[PDB]
Amino acid sequence: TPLMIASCSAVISDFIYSLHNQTDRTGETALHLAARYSRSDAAKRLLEASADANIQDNMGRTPLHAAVSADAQGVFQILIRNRATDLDARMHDGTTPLILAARLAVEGMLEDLINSHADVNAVDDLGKSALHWAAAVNNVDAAVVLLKNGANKDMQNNREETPLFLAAREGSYETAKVLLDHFANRDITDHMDRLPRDIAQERMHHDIVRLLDEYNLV
Amino acid sequence: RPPPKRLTREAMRNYLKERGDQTVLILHAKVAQKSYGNEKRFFCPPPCVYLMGSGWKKKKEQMERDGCSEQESQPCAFIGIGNSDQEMQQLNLEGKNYCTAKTLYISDSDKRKHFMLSVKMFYGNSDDIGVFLSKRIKVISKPSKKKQSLKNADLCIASGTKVALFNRLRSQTVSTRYLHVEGGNFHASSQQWGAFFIHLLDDDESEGEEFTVRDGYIHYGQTVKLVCSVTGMALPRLIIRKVDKQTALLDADDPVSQLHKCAFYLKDTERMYLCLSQERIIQFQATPCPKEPNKEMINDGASWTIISTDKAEYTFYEGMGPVLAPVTPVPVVESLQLNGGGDVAMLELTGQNFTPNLRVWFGDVEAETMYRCGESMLCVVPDISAFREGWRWVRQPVQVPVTLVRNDGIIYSTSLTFTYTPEP
Amino acid sequence: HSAVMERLRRRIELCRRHHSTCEARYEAVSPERLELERQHTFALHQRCIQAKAKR
DNA sequence: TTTCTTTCCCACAGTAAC
DNA sequence: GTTACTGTGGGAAAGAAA
């Protein structure tokens, strides 16, 4: 707790000259707080003094996850630049930093993670790749980068939904178009034999239906 | 007609005080025997549909205190098979708080591997309630009495899950009785059916309650303990044995599957089993044995059927009175993570069926909310000041509750509870 | 701080705009959706009424 | 050939309406 | 008693996966 207060808000270094102590409520370590409150200097010091950058807190998040969630560019650079750091870390629900990067509309961390060799076709416990999340959220730029760096465009999640399908359900016209551009298979049914066109017609997403029907065919 | 009303601060306070939520709820099997030709193999157990919650009554009263027949304020309801071109069957909910769907079945005309039950539901005066669906159900062309490996699960009971148990007298659909529970003891009603926790135990297990369960799928030969998911009363230790041709085997390692006839041996009393005597549940011994030292013949009445069970559950509240639309689709909030801290705290919510028209409320405070997608939503933790006059920082832990609220006033309760804490 | 803050203003505005788009996509379609549901509710309610008369 | 899985068939034994 | 019918469960037939 004493080391944690300096990092979370000379102090970090002097106490060190405890460390991996987890809190009772959240279960985060000093590194986690440094990441969350986005205190860059503190995270560097904690790492310097050989800290474990992969301790999971009560929900499975490591400091890197905390880093993306809090959009802390500095702590994030520091953790990815760190070798020990697991980039394909996993929360209890299977969520990965590459995925939070897709979801929270954070500038560039998704590509930095990709460039620093994170697995792109990794998936959450529901079996959703970042490309799937990218479609749900209609994050076109992330969708392009995931695709250029070899994502599986026709990947199916536990419910047999492809990324094109989630875009069809939410009506992500721009991402839906990009997936089509890349020849995404528009004929892959979900677990209840439903075409993305079908999910789209139901939600009255007329443009996505227009695209499924006439865009980049044969 | 009265324009949609934004839930007000005061209305929220009232709700937090009273809290008379209305909640639908659907219990059912995870599997279903597909019916061929013009047959009809009804879903067993029969999908029950309880209507829990003090709110349903408050709604009944409110409707009448506005000129409604006993017949105008009666929740109605039909059950069906997802998107199938058939006919939804009606459930009679008069006076009853629940109702089973005794004659549901899936033809082979339907090619889907899965489907989920659709339960349409409105009030007598055609006022609309919503459409709630069951968790997915898998279609099987016939149970597999053959061998079952541990790669194609979803078909193997697993310590922790729930299951229903029913006995079928001489092949007559009208006999079927399910292990149930009422008045503290185990019945065998051919009316209701209970879901049971089927915990796996290591042979070196103790006596009664306060025992420890261990993960793992269930194969015959293990010591399992069945508990009533509702009442709590449970059956003393047992050993599920694969059966066939009236013989309760002892030498069987095979993993228990879906819709598998099996007998339940007791706590090494001797060789006594658990049976149904066309009435209630009473002891037994299974005299026959001289066939082999590992193939104890048993009397027809304890060869139950094991089937795994799930439960879909939705709950809402009319926080601003009647609404033009249905309360369906209901928001389930599975995970609630904090994002950052202090001056910027935000909250990522993940769950199902979210929609652009919800704001999340922290106690009686409405917080800005950004819709990401059906399963993800973000919102902004409101300054601690909004809960403690002076406070420019969190002087002490203040735990308010989190809750989703549609734009027309429906309020969907969660269970989660954001707690403000001092920034270390 | 202005550079980082500027990145922050930029992120929320993006979330905010995305939300605004989805809500409007959703609301614009509400009438079409609500009228289609009521049409079905009517059919059952009509049937619920006749089922009562048969008794 | 094997080994299953999915479709067919058909006869117990209850119901229902005479 | 007589008749016409209908879920079920068990086993044969048709395919489909080794």
XYZ file of C-alpha atoms (C1' of nucleotides) in Angstrom:
733
model
C 0.000 0.000 0.000
C 2.800 2.508 0.786
C 4.591 1.922 -2.535
C 1.223 1.885 -4.279
C 0.242 5.369 -3.053
C 3.323 6.963 -4.635
C 2.838 5.184 -7.967
C -0.964 5.492 -8.210
C -1.382 9.213 -7.434
C 11.773 9.760 -5.663
C 8.944 8.067 -3.739
C 8.714 4.910 -5.869
C 12.517 4.499 -5.895
C 13.187 5.138 -2.172
C 10.702 2.565 -0.845
C 12.140 0.045 -3.309
C 15.819 1.144 -3.212
C 6.887 -5.012 -0.751
C 6.011 -4.820 -4.467
C 3.731 -7.538 -5.896
C 1.004 -6.849 -3.329
C -2.580 -7.244 -4.513
C -5.465 -5.156 -3.161
C -8.489 -6.799 -1.511
C -11.288 -5.217 -3.536
C -9.829 -5.105 -7.074
C -6.750 -7.281 -6.676
C -4.597 -4.901 -8.694
C -0.866 -4.516 -8.081
C 1.054 -1.265 -7.995
C 1.841 -1.747 -11.663
C -1.898 -2.039 -12.392
C -2.689 1.233 -10.650
C 0.174 2.956 -12.367
C -1.360 1.774 -15.589
C -4.907 2.784 -14.669
C -4.228 6.196 -13.309
C -1.893 6.380 -16.269
C 1.156 7.352 -14.159
C 4.011 6.696 -16.630
C 6.999 7.338 -14.409
C 5.651 5.012 -11.739
C 5.165 2.168 -14.152
C 8.689 2.527 -15.459
C 10.144 2.413 -11.975
C 8.095 -0.629 -11.025
C 9.230 -2.425 -14.111
C 12.867 -1.366 -13.663
C 12.877 -3.093 -10.297
C 12.035 -6.403 -11.992
C 8.277 -6.358 -11.427
C 5.934 -8.952 -12.908
C 3.980 -7.314 -15.689
C 1.542 -10.154 -15.980
C -0.136 -10.444 -12.590
C -3.871 -10.741 -13.014
C -6.260 -8.705 -10.902
C -9.656 -9.989 -9.790
C -11.123 -9.908 -13.291
C -8.097 -11.277 -15.108
C -6.729 -8.028 -16.412
C -3.002 -7.433 -16.406
C -1.527 -3.951 -16.381
C -1.463 -3.924 -20.145
C -5.245 -4.470 -20.194
C -5.636 -1.755 -17.674
C -3.427 0.349 -19.921
C -5.641 0.054 -22.970
C -8.851 0.487 -21.019
C -7.609 3.720 -19.495
C -6.107 4.829 -22.836
C -2.773 5.546 -21.128
C -0.451 5.999 -24.052
C 2.710 6.203 -21.992
C 2.211 3.202 -19.738
C 1.025 1.345 -22.807
C 4.185 2.083 -24.764
C 6.197 1.068 -21.765
C 4.442 -2.243 -21.372
C 4.581 -3.193 -25.027
C 8.161 -2.043 -25.318
C 8.818 -4.415 -22.365
C 9.778 -7.937 -23.525
C 8.369 -9.994 -20.646
C 4.897 -8.465 -21.181
C 2.325 -10.865 -22.522
C 0.524 -9.090 -25.355
C -2.045 -11.815 -25.755
C -2.928 -11.708 -22.070
C -6.367 -12.855 -21.050
C -9.133 -11.657 -18.776
C -11.399 -14.176 -17.100
C -13.895 -13.698 -19.923
C -11.192 -14.267 -22.516
C -10.829 -10.638 -23.512
C -7.427 -9.601 -24.846
C -5.637 -6.264 -25.132
C -5.873 -6.459 -28.901
C -9.623 -6.639 -28.445
C -10.024 -3.826 -25.995
C -8.002 -1.851 -28.506
C -10.637 -2.562 -31.139
C -13.605 -1.842 -28.867
C -12.832 1.354 -27.009
C -11.950 3.402 -30.059
C -8.461 4.167 -28.807
C -6.045 5.807 -31.221
C -3.318 3.546 -32.554
C -2.838 1.048 -29.729
C -4.463 -1.573 -31.874
C -1.829 -1.219 -34.574
C 1.041 -0.834 -32.160
C -0.043 -4.134 -30.647
C -0.287 -5.683 -34.045
C 3.110 -4.402 -35.131
C 4.620 -5.636 -31.889
C 3.385 -9.062 -33.014
C 0.221 -9.725 -31.008
C -1.930 -12.612 -32.182
C -4.737 -11.243 -34.326
C -6.923 -14.285 -34.636
C -6.920 -14.800 -30.859
C -10.466 -14.841 -29.465
C -12.500 -14.221 -26.324
C -14.432 -16.818 -24.395
C -17.369 -16.169 -26.720
C -15.015 -16.866 -29.598
C -14.937 -13.354 -31.016
C -11.809 -12.137 -32.766
C -10.882 -8.440 -32.645
C -12.031 -8.327 -36.211
C -15.462 -9.468 -34.906
C -15.471 -6.781 -32.307
C -14.270 -4.326 -34.916
C -17.380 -5.051 -36.934
C -19.763 -4.906 -33.989
C -18.417 -1.451 -33.257
C -18.036 -0.475 -36.910
C -14.426 0.550 -36.373
C -13.373 0.604 -39.948
C -9.774 1.634 -39.542
C -9.153 -1.187 -37.077
C -10.922 -3.524 -39.435
C -8.624 -2.635 -42.267
C -5.480 -3.064 -40.260
C -6.644 -6.355 -38.849
C -7.333 -7.556 -42.335
C -4.043 -6.310 -43.889
C -2.173 -8.073 -41.114
C -3.919 -11.334 -41.975
C -7.013 -11.689 -39.812
C -9.435 -14.475 -40.668
C -12.284 -12.579 -42.304
C -14.611 -15.555 -42.326
C -14.036 -16.557 -38.748
C -17.004 -17.838 -36.781
C -17.701 -17.215 -33.083
C -19.244 -19.833 -30.834
C -22.705 -18.792 -32.107
C -21.452 -19.330 -35.700
C -21.488 -15.595 -36.433
C -18.928 -14.222 -38.919
C -17.612 -10.700 -38.712
C -19.725 -9.691 -41.691
C -22.732 -10.978 -39.746
C -22.159 -8.815 -36.670
C -21.743 -5.828 -38.901
C -25.048 -6.794 -40.545
C -26.801 -7.042 -37.248
C -25.603 -3.672 -36.033
C -25.758 -2.035 -39.402
C -22.093 -1.077 -39.703
C -22.277 0.003 -43.283
C -18.658 1.133 -43.574
C -17.051 -1.941 -41.982
C -19.563 -4.184 -43.710
C -18.455 -2.717 -46.983
C -14.759 -3.235 -46.192
C -15.344 -6.860 -45.319
C -17.137 -7.294 -48.580
C -14.342 -5.472 -50.337
C -12.060 -8.210 -49.003
C -14.353 -10.958 -50.284
C -15.780 -11.901 -46.917
C -18.080 -14.876 -47.373
C -21.603 -13.455 -47.299
C -23.212 -16.880 -47.339
C -22.157 -18.212 -43.928
C -25.223 -18.820 -41.695
C -25.160 -18.312 -37.918
C -26.022 -21.105 -35.498
C -29.666 -20.890 -36.385
C -29.033 -21.022 -40.122
C -29.388 -17.245 -40.472
C -27.666 -15.305 -43.236
C -26.218 -11.905 -42.392
C -28.656 -10.617 -44.966
C -31.394 -12.156 -42.859
C -30.250 -10.609 -39.610
C -30.046 -7.321 -41.508
C -33.515 -7.507 -43.008
C -34.931 -8.211 -39.555
C -33.284 -5.193 -37.976
C -34.447 -3.131 -40.930
C -30.901 -2.240 -41.951
C -31.689 -1.526 -45.541
C -28.281 -0.366 -46.724
C -26.405 -3.395 -45.387
C -29.040 -5.427 -47.137
C -28.487 -3.481 -50.299
C -24.791 -4.235 -50.066
C -25.224 -7.892 -49.354
C -27.487 -8.120 -52.354
C -25.439 -6.223 -54.938
C -21.921 -5.284 -53.790
C -18.810 -6.868 -55.205
C -20.417 -10.085 -56.425
C -19.464 -13.190 -58.452
C -51.697 8.938 -26.785
C -49.344 10.161 -23.994
C -45.820 10.850 -25.392
C -42.871 8.725 -24.123
C -41.614 10.049 -20.777
C -37.976 10.308 -19.689
C -37.654 8.618 -16.293
C -37.330 11.303 -13.688
C -35.065 11.662 -10.743
C -38.014 11.209 -8.384
C -39.391 8.199 -10.206
C -36.032 6.530 -9.820
C -36.008 7.240 -6.144
C -39.432 5.624 -5.824
C -38.227 2.574 -7.624
C -35.159 2.209 -5.515
C -37.422 2.415 -2.476
C -40.195 0.003 -3.515
C -38.629 -2.090 -6.282
C -41.489 -4.167 -7.627
C -39.826 -5.599 -10.715
C -41.763 -7.787 -13.156
C -39.822 -10.791 -14.332
C -40.554 -13.454 -16.959
C -38.527 -16.616 -16.838
C -38.154 -19.717 -18.936
C -36.934 -23.136 -17.785
C -36.129 -25.867 -20.320
C -34.103 -28.764 -21.673
C -30.998 -28.102 -23.761
C -31.791 -30.878 -26.162
C -34.788 -31.885 -28.260
C -35.662 -35.067 -30.132
C -36.511 -34.114 -33.715
C -39.829 -35.573 -34.821
C -40.037 -37.251 -38.270
C -42.773 -37.775 -40.859
C -45.972 -36.575 -39.148
C -44.896 -37.858 -35.706
C -44.786 -35.646 -32.663
C -42.225 -36.217 -29.929
C -43.106 -33.525 -27.388
C -40.352 -31.604 -25.631
C -39.743 -33.308 -22.323
C -39.416 -31.753 -19.841
C -42.141 -29.315 -20.939
C -40.850 -25.705 -21.105
C -42.232 -23.984 -18.035
C -42.852 -20.201 -17.975
C -42.934 -18.667 -14.498
C -43.939 -15.055 -13.910
C -42.110 -14.149 -10.664
C -42.007 -10.762 -8.980
C -44.199 -8.661 -6.738
C -44.481 -6.287 -9.680
C -46.861 -8.417 -11.691
C -49.508 -7.929 -9.010
C -48.811 -4.176 -8.725
C -49.305 -4.064 -12.469
C -52.565 -5.959 -12.155
C -53.794 -3.489 -9.614
C -52.649 -0.469 -11.554
C -54.405 -1.659 -14.665
C -57.709 -2.252 -12.879
C -57.531 1.056 -10.985
C -57.931 2.331 -14.532
C -60.984 0.386 -15.641
C -59.917 -3.127 -16.560
C -61.823 -6.413 -16.488
C -60.326 -9.284 -14.533
C -60.089 -10.486 -18.127
C -58.435 -7.291 -19.441
C -55.503 -7.363 -17.033
C -54.547 -11.001 -17.474
C -51.058 -11.681 -18.802
C -51.534 -13.839 -21.917
C -48.818 -15.875 -23.613
C -47.887 -18.118 -26.476
C -44.847 -20.332 -26.901
C -43.196 -21.248 -30.174
C -40.179 -22.422 -32.121
C -38.106 -19.395 -33.128
C -38.614 -18.577 -36.810
C -40.658 -21.628 -37.839
C -43.721 -21.383 -40.099
C -45.999 -23.260 -37.701
C -48.408 -22.086 -35.006
C -47.602 -20.741 -31.560
C -49.411 -22.663 -28.825
C -51.052 -20.762 -25.980
C -50.203 -21.161 -22.362
C -53.060 -20.896 -19.877
C -51.916 -18.604 -17.064
C -55.282 -18.006 -15.362
C -54.823 -17.865 -11.602
C -51.570 -19.778 -12.032
C -48.185 -18.088 -11.582
C -46.515 -20.286 -14.203
C -47.463 -22.701 -16.975
C -45.834 -25.561 -18.862
C -45.903 -26.156 -22.613
C -46.916 -29.788 -22.687
C -47.212 -30.302 -26.447
C -44.280 -28.546 -28.153
C -42.345 -30.429 -30.791
C -39.931 -29.911 -33.686
C -40.680 -31.450 -37.097
C -37.920 -32.650 -39.406
C -39.082 -30.035 -41.915
C -36.842 -27.716 -39.864
C -33.171 -28.072 -40.838
C -31.686 -25.975 -37.990
C -29.158 -27.552 -35.631
C -30.440 -25.261 -32.931
C -33.323 -22.980 -32.122
C -34.694 -21.250 -29.083
C -38.250 -21.104 -27.813
C -40.113 -17.906 -28.460
C -42.612 -16.807 -25.820
C -44.870 -13.982 -27.071
C -46.742 -12.298 -24.298
C -49.267 -9.482 -23.826
C -52.052 -8.456 -21.456
C -55.759 -9.158 -22.027
C -56.488 -5.787 -23.581
C -53.832 -6.387 -26.210
C -51.488 -4.074 -24.278
C -48.037 -5.398 -25.161
C -45.521 -6.974 -22.815
C -42.810 -8.377 -25.010
C -41.178 -11.454 -26.477
C -38.800 -13.440 -24.401
C -36.751 -16.386 -25.671
C -35.159 -19.423 -24.147
C -31.473 -20.209 -24.246
C -30.611 -22.135 -27.414
C -31.694 -25.733 -27.669
C -29.906 -28.375 -29.772
C -31.713 -30.745 -32.101
C -30.741 -34.422 -32.005
C -31.957 -37.113 -34.419
C -32.027 -39.622 -31.584
C -30.091 -40.021 -28.363
C -26.757 -41.838 -28.698
C -26.948 -45.080 -26.726
C -23.584 -45.934 -28.276
C -20.204 -44.758 -27.029
C -19.501 -41.096 -26.249
C -15.995 -39.614 -26.303
C -15.019 -36.431 -24.423
C -14.464 -34.281 -27.514
C -18.067 -33.710 -28.577
C -19.292 -32.297 -25.267
C -22.322 -30.030 -24.840
C -23.877 -33.492 -24.658
C -22.246 -34.562 -21.398
C -23.683 -33.597 -18.046
C -20.954 -31.761 -16.149
C -20.560 -31.334 -12.398
C -22.260 -28.025 -11.718
C -24.911 -27.876 -14.440
C -28.556 -28.814 -13.837
C -30.767 -31.630 -15.047
C -34.292 -32.987 -15.039
C -35.231 -36.602 -14.302
C -38.331 -38.366 -15.530
C -39.788 -41.889 -15.601
C -41.857 -43.328 -18.493
C -44.337 -46.104 -17.572
C -44.766 -48.694 -20.324
C -44.277 -46.231 -23.211
C -47.309 -44.043 -22.461
C -46.901 -40.281 -22.781
C -49.617 -39.846 -20.137
C -47.609 -41.610 -17.427
C -44.434 -39.484 -17.505
C -43.527 -38.137 -14.057
C -40.555 -35.887 -13.163
C -38.592 -35.852 -9.956
C -39.963 -32.727 -8.265
C -40.104 -31.305 -4.728
C -42.721 -29.725 -2.457
C -43.492 -29.664 1.253
C -39.855 -30.495 1.893
C -39.784 -33.970 0.326
C -39.225 -35.542 -3.114
C -42.387 -36.169 -5.173
C -42.649 -37.604 -8.664
C -45.326 -35.332 -10.095
C -46.490 -35.836 -13.648
C -47.400 -32.171 -13.417
C -44.305 -30.103 -12.531
C -40.579 -30.806 -12.817
C -37.539 -29.564 -10.977
C -34.023 -28.719 -12.104
C -31.262 -30.325 -10.083
C -27.650 -29.457 -9.436
C -25.697 -32.612 -10.144
C -22.398 -32.272 -8.311
C -19.617 -34.814 -8.907
C -17.752 -36.272 -5.933
C -14.477 -38.139 -5.437
C -15.019 -41.698 -4.156
C -13.337 -40.642 -0.888
C -16.305 -38.436 0.019
C -17.860 -37.775 3.422
C -21.399 -37.660 4.839
C -23.857 -34.836 4.155
C -23.908 -31.094 3.427
C -20.900 -28.755 3.632
C -19.081 -31.183 1.318
C -16.789 -30.103 -1.506
C -17.621 -30.532 -5.196
C -15.004 -31.004 -7.895
C -15.091 -29.959 -11.567
C -15.392 -32.539 -14.317
C -17.901 -34.203 -16.612
C -19.971 -37.098 -15.307
C -19.561 -40.774 -16.268
C -21.328 -43.697 -14.612
C -19.700 -45.054 -11.483
C -18.994 -41.729 -9.804
C -20.615 -40.512 -6.610
C -23.005 -37.671 -7.452
C -25.216 -35.540 -5.225
C -28.507 -34.096 -6.536
C -29.797 -30.848 -5.047
C -33.023 -28.940 -5.636
C -32.064 -25.652 -7.283
C -35.011 -23.929 -5.605
C -35.935 -25.514 -2.260
C -32.467 -26.794 -1.466
C -33.445 -30.215 -0.124
C -31.109 -32.803 -1.643
C -30.851 -36.559 -2.119
C -28.240 -38.412 -0.034
C -25.124 -39.434 -2.021
C -25.659 -41.711 -5.049
C -23.931 -43.452 -7.942
C -25.429 -43.059 -11.398
C -25.310 -46.360 -13.253
C -25.878 -46.757 -16.988
C -28.809 -49.105 -17.594
C -30.458 -51.157 -20.344
C -32.867 -54.085 -20.656
C -33.822 -53.617 -16.984
C -30.229 -54.230 -15.844
C -28.385 -51.734 -13.664
C -24.707 -52.314 -14.568
C -21.878 -51.845 -12.049
C -18.934 -52.129 -14.444
C -19.472 -49.057 -16.622
C -17.048 -46.147 -17.037
C -18.792 -44.522 -20.001
C -19.599 -40.811 -19.494
C -23.280 -40.052 -18.859
C -24.905 -38.453 -21.890
C -28.087 -36.559 -22.738
C -31.388 -38.474 -22.538
C -29.648 -41.515 -21.112
C -31.638 -43.983 -19.036
C -29.740 -44.595 -15.815
C -30.364 -45.878 -12.284
C -29.287 -44.128 -9.098
C -27.590 -46.275 -6.448
C -27.548 -45.080 -2.833
C -24.906 -44.421 -0.159
C -23.676 -48.018 0.027
C -26.717 -48.826 2.170
C -26.521 -52.252 0.524
C -27.779 -52.408 -3.055
C -30.850 -50.223 -2.605
C -31.814 -47.853 -5.406
C -34.036 -44.845 -6.005
C -37.339 -45.738 -7.657
C -40.793 -44.413 -8.534
C -43.830 -46.500 -7.551
C -46.399 -44.936 -9.900
C -46.962 -42.560 -6.969
C -44.069 -41.188 -4.919
C -40.392 -41.897 -4.256
C -39.636 -44.851 -1.985
C -36.749 -47.213 -1.171
C -35.938 -50.409 -3.075
C -33.413 -53.254 -3.321
C -33.568 -54.814 -6.808
C -33.675 -58.497 -5.873
C -32.376 -60.045 -9.147
C -28.579 -60.322 -9.352
C -27.676 -63.830 -10.702
C -26.880 -62.762 -14.272
C -23.297 -61.750 -13.446
C -21.488 -60.106 -10.493
C -21.721 -56.822 -12.437
C -25.214 -56.559 -13.957
C -27.844 -56.200 -11.208
C -31.290 -56.436 -12.792
C -33.730 -53.760 -11.621
C -37.524 -53.330 -11.372
C -39.106 -50.980 -13.941
C -39.638 -47.791 -11.974
C -36.146 -46.522 -11.237
C -34.784 -46.284 -14.770
C -34.956 -42.503 -14.886
C -34.017 -40.322 -17.836
C -31.313 -37.702 -17.445
C -31.571 -34.475 -19.403
C -29.594 -31.277 -18.835
C -31.424 -28.043 -18.160
C -31.073 -24.318 -18.613
C -33.005 -21.212 -17.617
C -33.571 -17.886 -19.399
C -34.589 -15.011 -17.096
C -35.659 -11.401 -17.803
C -36.847 -8.692 -15.446
C -38.217 -5.168 -15.962
C -40.253 -2.353 -14.451
C -42.692 0.269 -15.813
C -41.035 3.176 -13.989
C -43.065 5.815 -15.851
C -46.290 3.927 -16.307
C -47.535 2.155 -19.454
C -45.424 2.486 -22.596
C -46.319 2.357 -26.294
C -43.700 -0.330 -26.982
C -42.813 -3.729 -25.482
C -40.297 -4.007 -22.662
C -38.528 -6.686 -24.680
C -35.591 -6.971 -25.612
C -34.260 -6.935 -22.069
C -30.677 -5.949 -21.155
C -28.564 -8.463 -19.265
C -25.363 -6.976 -17.875
C -22.798 -9.737 -17.550
C -19.612 -7.809 -16.845
C -18.912 -4.387 -15.403
C -15.319 -3.174 -15.651
C -13.877 0.143 -14.469
C -11.794 2.084 -17.051
C -9.185 4.443 -15.720
C -9.773 6.402 -12.549
C -10.434 9.701 -10.797
C -11.117 12.719 -13.031
C -11.788 10.405 -15.988
C -13.307 7.199 -14.658
C -15.491 5.480 -17.221
C -17.291 2.143 -17.128
C -17.384 -0.518 -19.778
C -20.469 -2.664 -19.650
C -20.773 -5.935 -21.456
C -23.818 -8.123 -21.690
C -26.529 -8.824 -24.232
C -29.256 -6.957 -26.072
C -28.039 -3.444 -25.352
C -29.593 -0.676 -27.455
C -28.797 2.946 -28.339
C -31.709 4.087 -26.191
C -30.451 3.296 -22.658
C -28.517 5.399 -20.172
C -27.061 3.761 -17.100
C -28.010 5.230 -13.748
C -25.784 5.250 -10.701
C -28.317 5.158 -7.933
C -30.606 8.077 -8.726
C -28.059 9.743 -11.028
C -28.227 9.443 -14.776
C -24.740 9.175 -16.257
C -23.756 9.955 -19.834
C -23.827 6.772 -21.826
C -22.169 5.732 -25.060
C -23.544 2.761 -26.938
C -20.784 0.664 -28.463
C -22.859 -2.283 -29.602
C -25.384 -4.967 -28.738
C -22.908 -6.500 -26.257
C -20.805 -3.500 -25.180
C -21.715 -0.081 -23.785
C -19.662 2.683 -22.078
C -20.739 5.311 -19.554
C -19.192 8.096 -17.510
C -18.850 7.732 -13.766
C -20.551 10.863 -12.269
C -18.570 13.117 -9.971
C -18.646 11.878 -6.331
C -20.034 15.377 -5.619
C -23.346 14.288 -7.102
C -23.683 12.060 -4.052
C -22.051 14.064 -1.252
C -22.417 17.834 -1.035
C -18.915 18.935 -0.089
C -16.623 16.246 -1.442
C -14.103 17.221 -4.111
C -12.517 13.761 -3.691
C -13.859 10.557 -2.131
C -13.744 11.127 1.619
C -15.235 7.685 2.295
C -16.623 4.630 0.450
C -20.032 5.411 -1.069
C -21.702 2.509 -2.832
C -24.580 3.381 -5.159
C -26.311 0.845 -7.394
C -25.974 0.509 -11.139
C -29.026 0.141 -13.282
C -30.078 0.403 -16.932
C -32.987 2.606 -17.982
C -34.694 2.820 -21.365
C -35.790 6.177 -22.758
C -39.485 5.698 -22.308
C -39.090 4.902 -18.647
C -38.859 1.119 -18.428
C -36.201 0.372 -15.891
C -34.194 -2.855 -16.075
C -32.552 -3.770 -12.768
C -29.129 -5.348 -12.699
C -27.575 -6.450 -9.454
C -24.220 -4.742 -9.871
C -23.171 -1.881 -7.609
C -20.518 0.690 -8.470
C -18.643 1.763 -5.325
C -16.789 5.042 -5.105
C -13.392 4.597 -3.436
C -10.573 6.993 -2.465
C -7.959 7.421 -5.195
C -4.802 6.003 -3.565
C -1.249 18.056 -21.226
C -3.093 19.890 -23.993
C -1.768 17.332 -26.495
C -2.925 14.387 -24.356
C -6.126 16.188 -23.363
C -6.695 16.861 -27.054
C -6.441 13.115 -27.684
C -8.996 12.605 -24.954
C -11.464 15.155 -26.353
C -11.051 13.401 -29.653
C -11.865 9.924 -28.306
C -15.024 10.827 -26.484
C -16.305 12.802 -29.401
C -15.867 9.757 -31.540
C -17.765 7.504 -29.100
C -20.348 10.205 -28.705
C -20.860 10.517 -32.444
C -21.044 6.819 -32.976
C -23.727 6.600 -30.372
C -25.676 9.437 -31.866
C -25.645 7.651 -35.174
C -26.842 4.338 -33.841
C -29.683 5.852 -31.837
C -30.962 7.716 -34.793
C -30.670 4.628 -36.943
C -32.668 2.804 -34.272
C -35.303 5.424 -33.642
C -35.992 6.062 -37.327
C -36.900 2.428 -37.681
C -38.953 2.157 -34.464
C -42.354 2.878 -36.039
C -41.775 0.332 -38.766
C -40.795 -2.209 -36.124
C -43.471 -1.399 -33.551
C -46.296 -1.503 -36.065
C -45.135 -4.910 -37.301
C -45.086 -6.329 -33.774
C -48.550 -5.017 -32.944
C -49.870 -6.638 -36.109
C -48.749 -10.005 -34.672
C -49.980 -9.185 -31.175
C -53.339 -8.467 -32.723
C -53.487 -11.813 -34.472
C -52.896 -13.747 -31.278
C -55.135 -11.560 -29.211
C -57.860 -12.135 -31.758
C -57.227 -15.860 -31.395
C -57.057 -15.549 -27.630
C -60.572 -14.051 -27.805
C -62.096 -16.803 -29.961
C -60.448 -19.537 -27.882
C -62.426 -18.094 -24.955
C -65.754 -18.187 -26.865
C -65.317 -21.849 -27.821
C -65.494 -22.753 -24.112
C -15.270 -53.586 -45.696
C -16.439 -50.900 -40.387
C -18.913 -47.436 -37.382
C -22.034 -44.271 -36.561
C -26.025 -41.073 -37.451
C -30.232 -39.993 -39.423
C -34.735 -41.744 -41.265
C -38.083 -45.013 -41.489
C -41.469 -48.395 -39.661
C -44.524 -50.355 -36.553
C -46.674 -52.323 -32.799
C -47.903 -51.555 -27.268
C -51.448 -49.493 -24.571
C -53.741 -45.258 -23.371
C -57.516 -41.639 -24.996
C -61.840 -40.354 -26.731
C -66.344 -40.642 -28.552
C -69.548 -43.601 -29.226
C -67.162 -53.439 -26.366
C -65.679 -51.182 -30.784
C -63.219 -48.020 -33.599
C -60.206 -44.685 -35.044
C -56.117 -42.459 -33.363
C -51.609 -41.107 -31.255
C -46.833 -40.533 -28.426
C -43.134 -43.755 -27.634
C -39.460 -46.862 -27.676
C -37.089 -50.382 -30.059
C -35.206 -52.090 -34.055
C -34.479 -52.273 -39.456
C -32.844 -49.401 -43.620
C -30.381 -45.589 -45.765
C -26.789 -42.811 -45.871
C -22.482 -40.600 -44.430
C -18.025 -40.645 -42.225
C -13.819 -43.555 -41.632
